[PDB]
C-alpha cells in the first residue's frame, strides 16, 4: 500500500565456507536510484557526426561517426565489480582465494516513490514536491535478451559503488546500422582524404522498442518488482597469474660448474659448448642448443599488430589484443596496447569532492607475463649463420614501408596453433563481471572486457521509465511535444550476486604477494574530514601459479 | 630383508591381439640405475649468465641467461621412445599399425643396494666398497604434480635405451623467475646494445622443495617402491601421414584430351580455356579457373614467420612452428624450421664406443606434406591482371625493410580459421612420448615435442636421493658444508608402458612404404666386434592416408 | 545458364554475402605505439605505403 514498505535494504557480503576448501560468496548490493522522466517520450534515430575532427589529417583515430537509437528508457546496470564488493571484501577474495566462479544473479525494485514538481510563478525560483500516489513506474525485464546488449561498464555508467550514496540509471540507447568510409592520412598528406557517411543499409535495419518486445510492469508506490534468480554457466576465473615465459618451460640445462661464493657477480656455467650440447630444437640446420633456440612444448602468449586500425562497413576500429605489453612491470611507462585504461567519474571511484569534467584514469598492469617485448624481437635468415650480418636480420629498428616510426613488429602476427594464453583478469572496481557471447557461428576464445562470458545467455537487461503523467491539455493530433506533469521517481534497487570460490593453498617455501594496507595507501580506503570517498583500483591475480 | 630380492627384471614387449583389429602393446623396461650422493645437500638459486657471448653483435640467438633452482634430488625419467622399444618392436608398430593410444604407465624401484666407499691413505690410490645395510634411499613420487614439470627428453637425459647397459638419473633442477632484456643487433651495429639482467620479480617467486611438497619413502636394502598404475586420457596418435596439399583436394578437372602413347612427354590436356572453364573460386574479379585459383574446402598447413625470435619478460625465444619445411623431402638440405633436430650422447643412440663430447645429431623429416615452400610463395594485387607486372607482385626475392636477406615470407603468417594440420609424429628413439598440458586458460591445439598431451594430468615425476650418511663430527651450527660418508646406490627400476593400437588395412592396389633392414642399414641394429651399439632414428608415419 | 545459349562461355556470377564480417583494407592503417595525434608521416603506415 501507500504506507507499507515492500523490501529491505541489504548490502552485506557473506562468505559461507563449504567443505573441501570451497566458499559461497553472496554479495548483496542496495542502492537508492533516482530517475527523471525522459526528455522525450519518443524513439529518435540520431546520427552523431564529427567529420570536422577527422578532416584534420592524421586524426582518423578520433572518428566518432555513428548512428544510435535514443530511447525514452533508462538502463539499470550492476555489471561492475565495485557495485558488489568494497576494498575489504576484494582484499579477502584476492588474498585467500585461487579461483572464482559466477553462480547466480538476482535483482529487484522496491519502495517506489513518485513525486511531481510544482514550480511557482514567483520571480525568485521556488518549488514544491508532492507525492503522486497514483503515478506509475514502467519496469521491463528483457529476460529473453531480445534487445541489444549494451553493458554500461564500458562507458562507466553502472550503478554507484557506494551503498550510502544514491545513484542513477543511465539513459538507454543502442547502435543503428550505418555505412562509413574514412581513408587514413597523416600530417603532411596533400588533398582531402575520402571521408563520407553513406547512410544506412536497408537490409541491416533493426529498430527495437521496449514496448513491442518486452512485458512492462506498472509499479505504483505500493508495488515491487523481482526478476528472479538467474544461474550462470560460465567458466572458472583464475585469481592466480602465470609468470613462465617460453624461456622458463621444461628442464633447465645442467650446470657443470656452480658458483663457489655467493654474490651477484658469481654465475653458474653450463660448461658445454653451445654447439656440442644435447637436446632438441626445431632448427634443423643448426647445432647450437641455447636457451633461445631449444625446443619448448608450445608458445606462451602471441604477438599481434599493435595500434593497428581495421576498417569495415562502419569505419575504423582498433584491433584488440588479449595480453598486455611485456615490460610494463619493469617499466610502468611501457603500458600501452593490451593494458586496459579505465576512465571514470565520481560515482565509480573518483574522489567525490573533485570539481570539473576531467575523469579519474588508471592503466591496469596485469601480473601475468604473457605479454611481448617487441623491442627485443627480431627475424633472421633461415641459414642462421652467427653472428648475423646486416642483410640477414630484420630488427625492430628497421623501417617498414619507408617509415622510420614503423617496424615489422607493428605488423607482426605470431598467433598460431601453438599459442597458449590466459583470460583477462578481473579489474576492480571498474571492471565488468560478465559479458554476452557473440551470436556468430565461430566465437572468440575470450573477451577482453570481462572475465566471464555468457555461453547461452545471461540475465536480461533491466529498463526503467517514468510513465507519462499527462496534463489536462493533451492532444495526440498535435505535432508539438507531449505536455507532461514534471514527475520523477526514487526507488530502492537490491541485487544479489552469488559466486563460488576456492581457497588458495601454499605450494612453495616462500610467501606470495598479498594486497595490504600501508602508509602510502592508508587514506585511499577511508573518508576525508568532509566525507570525500574514493575507490582506487586493486589487482586480482596476485598469487603465482606454475604454467608447466 | 638383506638377502631377499624385492623384484624381477622384465624388459619384454608383449603384443596381445584383440578382436576387431586392436592390439594391447605392453612394453616392459628394466634398468640398473646408479646414483651418487648429491654434491650438495642444499637447494641453490644459481644464475647462469653468458653476457660475454651475446655481447658480440649478432649473437643474441645464443642467449643462455637464466636462473635455476638446483636441488639435491635426481630425476628418474622414462619419457622417451627408446626406453621402451627396440628397433624390431618399433618396426612392427610402424609397419603393422595405423594409430597408437597411450593407455597406462607404471614404475617401481627394487633391489636397492647402498655402498660406502673407504679410500686409503696409501700414496697410490686404492679403495674398498662396503655394503651399508642400514643406509636409506629417499624416493619421492610427485603424484599430485606439485613440482615443476621438467621432462628430460628435451635435454637427452632420460634413462638409457639399452636393457643390458646400466643407466643413471639426471640431477633435478627447475627454472626460477628472472627478468632479462636483450636488444638484437647484427655484425655492423655501432655501440653496445642494451643487454641487462634485471633480477627477479617478487610476485613470481616460487621456491619448491621435495621435502615440503611430496611424501618421501626411505628404502633400505630390503625395501621396494611402486608408484601404482596411472591411466592416460590423451588423444589417439596417427601412424599414417597425409600427402594431399591444397592442390590435390577435391575433383580434378576433366581432361578432354588424353595421351595416346605412354611416356613422360605425353600429357593429358584439360581442353578448355582457363577463362572459359566452369567451377568455383574465391577470386570474384577473375574468370580464370586453374589448379592454383580454384576453390578448396580449407587450407592444409599454414605459413608462419620462420626463425623469428620473440622477446618476453625473460628474454628472447624462437617462435615454434607445428609443421616442418616443404621440400625437405625433395631436398634433404632444405630441412630447417619445424624439422626437429635431436642431439644425444652414448646412452641414447650414439655409438657407445665413440670418444669426445661431440653428440650424435639428426634432423627429423616427417613424411606428412603439411609444410610450406616459401620460395614458391608470392603476393599480388587484388586486380589480378595477368601476366603480373613488377609493382603488382611481391616475390620472395623482394627485400623487406631494406634487407636483401629478409623477405615477406620471413614475417608472413597465414594461420586462420581454415587452417588444418596434423599432430607431430613420434620420433624414435629420442622423441618424447607424453607431455603435460599448459595450465593456461586458453591452451595450444598441440605440442611440438610429444605426440601425446596430458589434458588433466600425467604420472608424477619420480625423484631419488641418497639419504645423508653423516660422520661422527656433524655440527649443524657450523657454516661449513655437511660432512658425509661417501655413499652411493644401485637400484633396479622397472616400468610398464601400455599402449592400445589399431592394425592397419590395405586400402589401395599398390603397396605402401615399410621400414626394412637392408645392406646399407644392416649393421645399425647389431653390436660390433667389441660390443659397440647404437640406435639410429626411425620414421613412424610411413603409410599414407587420404586427407579428403 | 540460359539453356538456348551457344558457345563454351559459361554463365558467371560473384556472390556478395549480406553479412558484414569483411574488411575494407583501404581504410586500415598502422601507427606508432606513442599515438601522438595528429599522426605524422613516419609514425603511420598507410595502405598506400609501398
Amino acid at each position: 500500500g501507500v504506507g507499507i514498505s515492500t523490501g529491505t535494504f541489504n548490502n552485506q557480503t557473506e562468505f559461507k565456507f563449504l567443505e573441501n576448501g570451497w566458499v559461497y560468496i553472496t554479495a548483496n548490493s542496495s542502492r537508492l536510484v533516482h530517475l527523471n522522466m525522459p526528455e522525450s517520450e519518443n524513439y529518435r534515430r540520431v546520427v552523431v557526426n564529427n567529420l570536422d575532427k577527422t578532416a584534420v589529417n592524421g586524426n582518423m583515430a578520433l572518428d566518432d561517426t555513428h548512428a544510435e537509437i535514443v530511447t525514452p528508457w533508462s538502463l539499470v546496470d550492476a555489471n561492475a565489480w565495485g557495485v558488489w564488493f568494497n576494498p575489504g571484501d576484494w582484499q579477502l577474495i584476492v588474498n585467500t582465494m585461487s579461483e572464482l566462479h559466477l553462480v547466480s544473479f538476482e535483482q529487484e525494485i522496491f519502495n517506489v516513490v513518485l513525486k511531481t514538481v510544482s514550480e511557482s510563478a514567483t520571480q525568485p525560483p521556488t518549488k514544491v514536491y508532492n507525492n503522486d500516489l497514483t503515478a506509475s513506474l514502467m519496469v521491463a525485464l528483457d529476460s529473453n535478451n531480445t534487445m541489444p546488449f549494451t553493458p554500461a561498464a564500458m562507458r562507466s555508467e553502472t550503478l554507484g559503488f557506494y551503498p550510502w550514496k544514491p545513484t542513477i540509471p543511465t539513459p538507454w540507447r543502442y547502435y543503428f546500422q550505418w555505412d562509413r568510409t574514412l581513408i587514413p592520412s597523416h600530417t603532411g598528406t596533400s588533398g582531402t582524404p575520402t571521408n563520407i557517411y553513406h547512410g544506412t543499409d536497408p537490409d541491416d535495419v533493426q529498430f527495437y522498442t521496449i514496448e513491442n518486445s518486452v512485458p512492462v510492469h506498472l509499479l505504483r508506490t505500493g508495488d515491487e518488482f523481482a526478476t528472479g534468480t538467474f544461474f550462470f554457466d560460465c567458466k572458472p576465473c583464475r585469481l592466480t597469474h602465470t609468470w613462465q615465459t617460453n624461456r622458463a618451460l621444461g628442464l633447465p640445462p645442467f650446470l657443470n660448474s656452480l658458483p663457489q661464493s655467493e654474490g651477484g657477480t658469481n654465475f653458474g656455467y653450463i660448461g658445454v659448448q653451445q654447439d656440442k650440447r644435447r637436446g632438441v630444437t626445431q632448427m634443423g640446420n643448426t647445432n647450437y642448443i641455447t636457451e633461445a633456440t631449444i625446443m619448448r612444448p608450445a608458445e606462451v602468449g602471441y604477438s599481434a599488430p599493435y595500434y593497428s586500425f581495421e576498417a569495415s562497413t562502419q569505419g575504423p576500429f582498433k584491433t584488440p589484443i588479449a595480453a598486455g605489453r611485456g615490460g610494463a612491470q619493469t617499466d610502468e611507462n611501457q603500458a600501452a596496447d593490451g593494458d586496459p585504461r579505465y576512465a571514470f567519474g565520481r560515482q565509480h571511484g573518483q574522489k567525490t569532492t573533485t570539481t570539473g569534467e576531467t575523469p579519474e584514469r588508471f592503466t591496469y598492469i596485469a601480473h601475468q607475463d604473457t605479454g611481448r617485448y617487441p623491442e627485443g624481437d627480431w627475424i633472421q635468415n633461415i641459414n642462421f649463420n652467427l653472428p648475423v650480418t646486416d642483410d640477414n636480420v630484420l630488427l625492430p629498428t628497421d623501417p617498414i614501408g619507408g617509415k622510420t616510426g614503423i617496424n615489422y613488429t607493428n605488423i607482426f602476427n605470431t598467433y598460431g596453433p601453438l599459442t597458449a594464453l590466459n583470460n583477462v583478469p578481473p579489474v576492480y572496481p571498474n571492471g565488468q563481471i560478465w559479458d554476452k557471447e557473440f551470436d556468430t557461428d565461430l566465437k572468440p576464445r575470450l573477451h577482453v572486457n570481462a572475465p566471464f562470458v555468457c555461453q547461452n545467455n545471461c540475465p536480461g537487461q533491466l529498463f526503467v521509465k517514468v510513465a507519462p503523467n499527462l496534463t489536462n491539455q493533451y492532444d495526440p493530433d498535435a505535432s508539438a511535444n507531449m505536455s507532461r506533469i514534471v514527475t520523477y521517481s526514487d526507488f530502492w534497487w537490491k541485487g544479489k550476486l552469488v559466486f563460488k570460490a576456492k581457497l588458495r593453498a601454499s605450494h612453495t617455501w616462500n610467501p606470495i604477494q598479498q594486497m595490504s594496507i600501508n602508509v602510502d595507501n592508508q587514506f585511499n580506503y577511508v573518508p576525508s574530514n568532509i566525507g570525500g570517498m574514493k575507490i582506487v583500483y586493486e589487482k586480482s591475480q596476485l598469487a603465482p601459479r606454475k604454467l608447466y | 630383508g638383506v638377502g631377499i630380492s624385492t623384484g624381477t627384471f622384465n624388459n619384454q614387449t608383449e603384443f596381445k591381439f584383440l578382436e576387431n583389429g586392436w592390439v594391447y602393446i605392453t612394453a616392459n623396461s628394466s634398468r640398473l640405475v646408479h646414483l651418487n650422493m648429491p654434491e650438495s645437500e642444499n637447494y641453490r638459486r644459481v644464475v647462469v649468465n653468458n653476457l660475454d657471448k651475446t655481447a658480440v653483435n649478432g649473437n643474441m640467438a645464443l642467449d643462455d641467461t637464466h636462473a635455476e633452482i638446483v636441488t639435491p634430488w635426481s630425476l628418474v625419467d622414462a619419457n622417451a621412445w627408446g626406453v621402451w622399444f627396440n628397433p624390431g618392436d618399433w618396426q612392427l608398430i610402424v609397419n603393422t599399425m595405423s594409430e597408437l593410444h597411450l593407455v597406462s604407465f607404471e614404475q617401481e624401484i627394487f633391489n636397492v643396494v647402498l655402498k660406502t666407499v673407504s679410500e686409503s691413505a696409501t700414496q697410490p690410490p686404492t679403495k674398498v666398497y662396503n655394503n651399508d645395510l642400514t643406509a636409506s634411499l629417499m624416493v619421492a613420487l610427485d603424484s599430485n604434480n606439485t613440482m615443476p614439470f621438467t621432462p628430460a627428453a628435451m635435454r637427452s637425459e632420460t634413462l638409457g635405451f639399452y636393457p643390458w647397459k646400466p643407466t643413471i638419473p639426471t640431477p633435478w633442477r627447475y627454472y626460477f623467475q628472472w627478468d632479462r632484456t636483450l636488444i638484437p643487433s647484427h655484425t655492423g651495429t655501432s655501440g653496445t646494445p642494451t643487454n641487462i639482467y634485471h633480477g627477479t620479480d617478487p610476485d613470481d617467486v616460487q621456491f619448491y622443495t621435495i621435502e615440503n611438497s611430496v611424501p618421501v619413502h626411505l628404502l633400505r636394502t630390503g625395501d621396494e617402491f611402486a608408484t601404482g598404475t596411472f591411466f592416460f586420457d590423451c588423444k589417439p596418435c596417427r601412424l599414417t601421414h597425409t600427402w594431399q596439399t591444397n592442390r590435390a583436394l577435391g575433383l580434378p578437372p576433366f581432361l578432354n584430351s588424353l595421351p595416346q602413347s605412354e611416356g613422360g612427354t605425353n600429357f593429358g590436356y584439360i581442353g578448355v580455356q582457363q577463362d572459359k572453364r566452369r567451377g568455383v573460386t574465391q577470386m570474384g574479379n577473375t574468370n580464370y579457373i586453374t589448379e592454383a585459383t580454384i576453390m578448396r574446402p580449407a587450407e592444409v598447413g599454414y605459413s608462419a614467420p620462420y626463425y623469428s625470435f620473440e622477446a618476453s619478460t625473460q628474454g628472447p625465444f624462437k617462435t615454434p612452428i607445428a609443421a616442418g619445411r616443404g621440400g625437405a623431402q625433395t631436398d634433404e638440405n632444405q630441412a630447417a624450421d619445424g624439422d626437429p633436430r635431436y642431439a644425444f650422447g652414448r646412452q641414447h643412440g650414439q655409438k657407445t664406443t665413440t670418444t669426445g663430447e661431440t653428440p650424435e645429431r639428426f634432423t627429423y623429416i616427417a613424411h606428412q606434406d603439411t609444410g610450406r615452400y616459401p620460395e614458391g610463395d608470392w603476393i599480388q594485387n587484388i586486380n589480378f591482371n595477368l601476366p603480373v607486372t613488377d609493382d603488382n607482385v611481391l616475390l620472395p626475392t623482394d627485400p623487406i625493410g631494406g634487407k636483401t636477406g629478409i623477405n615477406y615470407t620471413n614475417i608472413f603468417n597465414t594461420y586462420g580459421p581454415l587452417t588444418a594440420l596434423n599432430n607431430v609424429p613420434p620420433v624414435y628413439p629420442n622423441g618424447q612420448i607424453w607431455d603435460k598440458e599448459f595450465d593456461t586458460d586458453l591452451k595450444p591445439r598441440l605440442h611440438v615435442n610429444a605426440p601425446f598431451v596430458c589434458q588433466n594430468n600425467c604420472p608424477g615425476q619420480l625423484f631419488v636421493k641418497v639419504a645423508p650418511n653423516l660422520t661422527n663430527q656433524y655440527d649443524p651450527d657450523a657454516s661449513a658444508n655437511m660432512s658425509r660418508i661417501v655413499t652411493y646406490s644401485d637400484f633396479w627400476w622397472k616400468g610398464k608402458l601400455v599402449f592400445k593400437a589399431k592394425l592397419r588395412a590395405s586400402h589401395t592396389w599398390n603397396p605402401i612404404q615399410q621400414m626394412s633392414i637392408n645392406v646399407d642399414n644392416q649393421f645399425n641394429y647389431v653390436p660390433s666386434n667389441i660390443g659397440g651399439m647404437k640406435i639410429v632414428y626411425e620414421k613412424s608415419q610411413l603409410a599414407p592416408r587420404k586427407l579428403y | 545458364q540460359k539453356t538456348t545459349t551457344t558457345g563454351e562461355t559459361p554463365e558467371r556470377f560473384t556472390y556478395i554475402a549480406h553479412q558484414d564480417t569483411g574488411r575494407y583494407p583501404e581504410g586500415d592503417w598502422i601507427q606508432n605505439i606513442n599515438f601522438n595525434l595528429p599522426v605524422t608521416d613516419d609514425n603511420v603506415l598507410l595502405p598506400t605505403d609501398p
Partner: antibody
Amino acid sequence: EVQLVESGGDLVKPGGSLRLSCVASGFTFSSYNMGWVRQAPGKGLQWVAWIYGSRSSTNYADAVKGRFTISRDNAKNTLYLQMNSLRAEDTAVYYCARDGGSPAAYYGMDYWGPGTSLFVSS
Amino acid sequence: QTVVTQEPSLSVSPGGTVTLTCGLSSGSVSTSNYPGWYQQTLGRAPRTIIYRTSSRPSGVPNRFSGSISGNKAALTITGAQPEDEADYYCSLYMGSYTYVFGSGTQLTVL
C-alpha cells in the same frame, strides 16, 4: 606547451658541488626519459647524464661517472643534477633534455631548456 | 671511445640544397642509432630538427629532411633560407642508454 627551465647555475670553485634543478611543464613528467647535456664555452654539445624508466635508472658519461648524480622528483616535476668534485673542465652551459617517446623512446633530445651556465674557476 | 665526425663548416647559397653528414670513426650509422639533428643559433639553446633519423618535430619546416646515407646520417636542407644559418649538431644513440654528440657543423647561408 612543453617547457623546461633550468636553474642553479653559478660560479663555483674547483672541487665544489652544485645542484642544477630543471622544472618541466606542459606534459606528464614521470612518463618521459630526461637527461642533462652540456656545451663548453665555444665547444659542441656533450651528453652528460640520462634518467629513464619508471624505476629511474640512470646512466652517465665517462667524463662525469662517480662525480655526477642524476635524479628526478615526479611530484615536483623536477630533474636534479648534483655535481661533486667539480673541475674546470665542467664549466659550461647545461641543457635539460626531454625525450618525446614515452612508450617508444625517440632516443634523442625532443625538447631542450634554455640552459644554465656553470663556471668553475679558482 | 665513440667519436662522431661531421663537417666542421659548410656553406649553401639561398634557395640551394645542402647536406650535412654524421659518421662514426669506427663503425657505421644505422636507424638503430636513432640519429637526431639539432639546430643552435648564436646565444640560444639547441632546437630539435630531426629525431629517429626521419621525424621532424611539429613546426620544423619541410625543407629539413633526415635520412641514412651510406654508413652515416644525413640532414638535407632544400631551399635553404637565411634563418637556417646555425650550428647543426648530430646525436647518435650508442646502445644501452648512452648518447654521443658530433662535433657540429657551422652552416652559413651566403
